[PDB]
Every structure is written in C-alpha cells, then in structure tokens.
C-alpha cells in the first residue's frame, strides 16, 4: 500500500522485524539466564529447597579463557595491484583508535555472549577530539552492546551472518534517568 | 612477608638519618 507516514513505515519494519526477535530472542536471552543467574525458572520464594550443582560455567569459562588468549585483530593487506605500502597508513590508525579499553571490551562482552547465547555485537561511532585526535580532529571508537539478541533486531530478511545485506538493524537502549538526561543533552531533545 | 621486609627499611633508612647518620660523598 501507499502510506508515507514516516514513523509508520519505520515502526512497521521493526514490528515486522520483532516477530522474529520473538521465536528466537525468546530462547536466546534465556540462556543468558540459565547462566548469568539461577538455572531455576518461573517460580519465586517457593518453600522447598533449591540448589546448584551448576556444571556448565566451568566449560563456559574454559572457552572464554581460550578466546581471550587468541585475540585476533584485523590486518588490511595491500592488494594484487596496489603498491606494497598501501595499508600501513590505514592500519596505522585502525591500530590507533583501537588501542583504548573500549575496543577490547566491546569484543569480549560480545564473545562472552556469543558463547552462552550464540550471539553478540558491538558498534562503531564518531565524534570530535581536539587533544590527540586520530585525525581531522576526529577519532573512531568501538562501543559495547549488552544483550544483543534482544537489543539488536534487524529482520530486513538479512540472509547472512554479518548482516551486511540488511537495511534496518534497529537498536534499543535501556538507561537510567540521569542517562536519558545526559543523552537528550547530546542529541538535543526534550 | 617480604612486603614487611620493605616496611622494615621505610623504617630503617628513615631512622639512620636521625641517629646513626654520619655520611656524605662529594665529587671533586
């Protein structure tokens, strides 16, 4: 149909995209449950004893402990035709605004989550630094995303892993009062 | 322990200068 109401086209591609962050995200955020919390579900304060043999963490911790000591970064080789010293420039800075703790963290969280639930993610953003900028009074930075299975949903019908062929990727934020305050300050809102 | 070996100098160094003392090593 033809209904160019903007928030209607947009809320009707998220609402169309969360009927899937349903069937799946339902299971996903709940592994994040049997783990980072009690393996008992749906009853609180009951009267009989409830205890924790809790076997699974040890293998979790294992895997992480393995992925942590196998960092794996990017490379940027030149190309078949490119002159040898084509990347260095590039990498020179990738390695720059990728040193900070934020970059290291965004990943580990993502991986931690990838292991337990199967997913994970982080984002990239830009703003200005006047003192010690990567370049152009600008820098780039890798931010973290908690609970990505349920915070990121991009059903545009993305038929592959890197959601490189998608067009939505709607994300959501949960934040305190003061945060919303500091946020509406940044992006100029009421 | 050796951590306390250290607080046994922070206490010694800073003690000789008061009492035992008696040194000074100039160049030319």
């Amino acid at each position: 149909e033809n209904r160019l109401e903007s928030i209607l086209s947009r809320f009707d591609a998220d609402w169309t995209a969360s009927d899937e962050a349903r069937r799946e995200a339902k299971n996903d955020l709940f592994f994040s449950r049997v783990s980072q919390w009690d393996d008992w579900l749906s009853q609180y304060t009951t009267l009989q004893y409830r205890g924790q043999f809790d076997v699974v963490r040890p293998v979790v911790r294992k895997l992480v402990s393995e992925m942590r000591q196998n960092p794996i970064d990017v490379l940027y080789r030149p190309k078949d035709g490119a002159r040898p010293d084509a990347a260095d420039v590039l990498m020179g800075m990738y390695r720059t605004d990728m040193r900070h703790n934020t970059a290291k963290i965004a990943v580990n969280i993502a991986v931690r989550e990838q292991i337990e639930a199967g997913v994970g993610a982080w984002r990239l953003v830009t703003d200005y630094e006047d003192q010690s900028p990567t370049s152009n009074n600008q820098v780039i930075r890798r931010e973290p995303i908690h609970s990505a299975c349920s915070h990121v949903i991009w059903d545009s019908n993305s038929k592959l892993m890197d959601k490189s062929d998608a067009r939505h990727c709607t994300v959501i934020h949960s934040m305190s009062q003061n945060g919303w305050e500091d946020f509406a300050e940044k992006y100029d809102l009421d | 322990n050796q951590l306390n070996m250290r607080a046994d100098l922070e206490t010694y160094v800073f003690q000789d200068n008061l009492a035992t003392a008696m040194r000074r090593d100039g160049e030319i």
């Binding site: 076997v55 895997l63 639930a117 997913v119 959601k163 998608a166 | -």
Partner: protein, 145 residues
C-alpha cells in the same frame, strides 16, 4: 540524520547459525545443556530434602517396655546396659527386645542413576569437539564465525 561511512555500524558475532523454516536460528553452547542441567540441580535438591526432612534411626518401643527407665535411652553412657520391663499385670508381657529400628535414608537408586546419567549427558554435549591441548581448540568453529 546522516551518520558516517557506508555500512550499518553494527557487527554481530554468532555461535551456531543457519536458517530453517526460513526463520533465523542461532545458539550458544549453553542451549543443549539446560535440559540435563536442571535434572542435576533437581535430583540434587530432592536428595537434599531426603537427608534433611527425614526421621533418623531410632528403636520402636511400646511405652510399657521402657516405662520406669526411659532415662538410660536418652543418650546416657552412664549405664552398663539397657533394661526392659519383663512383666505387666494382665498378661505375660512379650518384650522381644526392640527388633525394630526405623530404616535409614538411602537416596533411591533412581535419583542415584539419574543424577549420574543426567550429568553424563551434559558433558556429552559440553564439547564442540575440544581437541588436544595447544591444538584445534574445540572452538575453531567459533573463532572463524
């Protein structure tokens, strides 16, 4: 509001991933384990009540065969022995020295077998094919994704 480059600034990491009904499916390792893991927990808890809320081993008397000296049976190491009323007007008391004790707690074979199996089945699926040390970390399939 136009943001920088020419991609969505969100890279996603996955464990096991694919499509089915044409619906998206993925999962971490944990999924397969939840099933037996609760069993573990459960049988655990059950057996916990068994040791707790269950009577301990003590003799079955009649008030009449102990009567007069229920004092030795309280835990006293004071006395050389234990006495029992032989007689009772209105019959020939039959005190067959307490051949009856409350049987001990035992943890049913079922809970015993099931726990063991429950935890076995878990570590079964608790390996992505973890290979020898220093090699083919069971997680190559994870590093690549």
């Amino acid at each position: 509001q136009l943001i920088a480059g020419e991609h969505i600034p969100i890279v996603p990491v996955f464990g096991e991933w694919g499509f089915v009904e044409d619906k998206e499916v993925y999962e971490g390792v944990v999924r397969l384990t939840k099933d037996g893991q609760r069993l573990r927990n459960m049988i655990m808890s059950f057996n916990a009540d068994i040791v707790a809320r269950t009577p301990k081993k003590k003799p079955f008397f009649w008030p009449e065969q102990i009567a007069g000296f229920e004092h030795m049976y309280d835990g006293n190491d004071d006395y050389p022995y234990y006495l029992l009323n032989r007689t009772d007007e209105n019959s020939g008391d039959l005190p067959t020295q307490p051949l009856a004790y409350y049987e001990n707690p035992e943890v049913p074979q079922a809970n015993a077998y099931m726990l063991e199996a429950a935890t076995s089945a878990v570590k079964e699926v608790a390996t992505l094919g973890v290979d020898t040390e220093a090699v083919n970390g069971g997680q190559v399939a994870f590093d690549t994704v």
